[PDB]
Each structure stands twice: as structure tokens, then as C-alpha cells.
Amino acid sequence: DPVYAEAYVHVNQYDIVLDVLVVNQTSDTLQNCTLELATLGDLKLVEKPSPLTLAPHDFANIKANVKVASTENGIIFGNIVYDVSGAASDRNCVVLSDIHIDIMDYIQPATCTDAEFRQMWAEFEWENKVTVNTNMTDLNDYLQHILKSTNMKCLTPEKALSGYCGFMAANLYARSIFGEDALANVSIEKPVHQGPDAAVTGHIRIRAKSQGMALSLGDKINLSQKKTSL
């Protein structure tokens, strides 16, 4: 419509913030509908610019701050239905459920003593694993990339050698914003001429408390793993 509203999300530092362009290229501060607040996850949405005019030929920035540490809603991965309403110069609108709400980001790296670790590794919520196998790179650059992407930790090296092969299994740990600790041992082949690694066939073993997020994390990482057309 003249009124075209375009919007995307910007998550700028904790705060997932809503860029909205409602552009009302309308022929007037056309009447506007209705909007509703809610508890969200460890967030709650929390602002609406008050008016409801769709000012003529006019462009507007409508900001929604979201509250990023509260409102539990357990509708995982978000993907929760959201409403913009048809309630005034509007007969309809958008009701939307979100998608676009993923993990790789959330968790931060976190750390451990290795013996205890091992013991723990085994000990943890075993229940998820996903496989590493396939890419576009060596796990040097590739590993770094993945690491940065998820913002997460590989705890320690043994020099055995991530180079000549290595035939290295890398142990990774991370802790998030709402505090889950997640453990990995992924054991991986690694690039190098007619030696081995341009796939893996390494297994990524994922432990996160719910299997459902945990596996999903293994996936998420799987998405993360490579670089291709989303």
C-alpha cells in the first residue's frame, strides 16, 4: 500500500529491537489499528510508539524495544505468534509467528579442568549429537569461523597437531545468557593433501539438557558449519 511498512529486526546489544518502517505513504495519518503487549521469553516486549495515524506520504520509525532478560514464554526458538492488527484503517494486518530466532549466537564460550571435564563430559546430558562431515575449508579457518559464529569455546589443545593431520578431537564448552552450559566433543579428520580432511566424518556430540534444544543446537551448528544460500 502507499503505506508500506517494511521492517526488520536489529538486535543490537541484548536488545532485540525492532526497526519498523511504517511508511505511510498513505494519503493521510490513516487510522491505525491495534497492537498488544506480552510476556515474552527471557525478554518481554515492551514498547510501542503510541499514535495511530498513518500520516500522509510520510515515513515513520517505529521502534520496539523488547526487554531482553525477561518474560518467560517457553515457546521455543521463539516462533510465537505476534500481532499487528487490522483494527483501524486496516481491515487486516499481519499476524505473524516468528521464525528467525536462533541459538548460535546466544551462547558464550565457557571453560573447565580436563580430567574433571572428561568425567563430566561423560556425565552430562548425553542425549544429542550431530555429525560433522563436509564443508569448503580447513578446520583451521573453518573452525575459527564456526567458533566466532557461535561465540563459543573449544577448551584446550594438545599439540598433536591440527596441521600434519591432526587426528585431534576438540573439546568445546560454552555458557549462555540464560545460563545453560553445553558440552562437546567432536572428533574430526582435518584437511591436508592426500592425508586426511575435506569432509570430516567427525561426530559432533552435543550435550544440552533438553534433547530438543540440544540436538537442535547440533543442527544449528550444522547450519553454522558451512557457508551457503540460506
Partner 1 sequence: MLTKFETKSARVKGLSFHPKRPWILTSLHNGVIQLWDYRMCTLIDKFDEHDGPVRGIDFHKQQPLFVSGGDDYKIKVWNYKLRRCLFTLLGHLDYIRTTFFHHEYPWILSASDDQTIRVWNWQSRTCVCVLTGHNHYVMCAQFHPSEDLVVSASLDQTVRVWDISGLRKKNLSPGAVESDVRGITGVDLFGTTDAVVKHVLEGHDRGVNWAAFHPTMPLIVSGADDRQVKIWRMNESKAWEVDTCRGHYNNVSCAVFHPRQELILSNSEDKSIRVWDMSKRTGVQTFRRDHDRFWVLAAHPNLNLFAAGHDGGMIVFKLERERPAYAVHGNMLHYVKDRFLRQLDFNSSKDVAVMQLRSGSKFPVFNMSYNPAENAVLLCTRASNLENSTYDLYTIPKDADSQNPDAPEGKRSSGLTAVWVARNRFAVLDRMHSLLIKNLKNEITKKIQVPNCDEIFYAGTGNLLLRDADSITLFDVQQKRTLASVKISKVKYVIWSADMSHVALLAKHAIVICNRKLDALCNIHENIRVKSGAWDESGVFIYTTSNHIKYAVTTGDHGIIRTLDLPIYVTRVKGNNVYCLDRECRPRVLTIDPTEFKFKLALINRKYDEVLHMVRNAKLVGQSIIAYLQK
Question: Which residues here bind partner 1, judged by CB under 8 A?
Answer: 1, 4-10, 19, 21, 81, 91-92, 94-95, 97, 228-230
CB 190 within 8 A of CB 196: yes
Instruction: Name the minimum Å distance from CB 6 to partner 1.
Output: 5
Instruction: Name the minimum Å distance from CB 155 to partner 1.
Output: 33
DSSP-assigned states of every residue in 35-88: B--EE-SSSEE----------TTEEEEEEEEEESS------TTS--EEEB--SS
Alpha carbons 145 and 153: distance in angstroms, whole number: 12
CA 210 from centroid of its chain's CA atoms? 17
Instruction: Name the minimum Å distance from CB 79 to partner 1.
Output: 11
CB 176 within 8 A of CB 107: yes
Instruction: Name the minimum Å distance from CB 39 to partner 1.
Output: 17
Q: Which three cell numbers stand for residue 192?
A: 591436508
Q: Which is nearer to partner 1, 168 or 217 (CB)?
A: 217
Instruction: Name the minimum Å distance from CB 153 to partner 1.
Output: 29
Alpha carbons 135 and 142: distance in angstroms, whole number: 8
Q: Which is nearer to partner 1, 23 or 174 (CB)?
A: 23
Q: Which is nearer to partner 1, 19 or 105 (CB)?
A: 19
Tell me the residue type at 39.
Answer: T
Q: Which is nearer to partner 1, 13 or 228 (CB)?
A: 228
Q: Which is nearer to partner 1, 91 or 193 (CB)?
A: 91
